[PDB]
Amino acid sequence: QREGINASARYPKNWVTTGDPAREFTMIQSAPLMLLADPDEFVSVQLA
Amino acid sequence: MYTTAQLLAANEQKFKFDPLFLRLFFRESYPFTTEKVYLSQIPGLVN
């Protein structure tokens, strides 16, 4: 929200902690919700 | 109230239809100005 970029596919975020222990980070966040416009179009045939 | 829930789906997936016979057979159409219609036929058949 600070960049107003919540709405996206992926999300990079690189950041570092302060203090005596100095250490950085790399970050990705995302939210896939893959869909099908025609759920009944495909037939899953379970072979046997 | 904070439940907008936008969508983008209006799937039809509803029909399978093509006559093709009015196009295979009925290529010619004829409007009428007549209340009734005749349609005769002559058979040819000799000994």
CA distances from A3 to A11, A20, A33, A43 (A): 11, 29, 23, 43
Q: Is A48 exposed, middle or buried (0-12, 13-18, 19+ CB in 10 A)?
A: exposed
CA pair distance B7, A35, nearest whole angstrom = 12
CA pair distance A24, A27, nearest whole angstrom = 10
| Structural method | cryo-EM
Mutate to test the interface with A, among B8, B12, B13, B14 (most CBs of A within 10 A): B13
Burial B14-23 (b: 16+ CB within 10 A, else e): eeeeeeeeee
Dihedral in degrees, nearest 10, Cα atoms A20, A23, A24, A28: -120
- B11 interfaces chain A, CB cutoff of 8 Å: yes
Q: Three-class SS string for chain A? A: CCCCCCCCCCCEEEEEECCCCCEEEEEECCCCCCCCCCCCCCCCCCCC
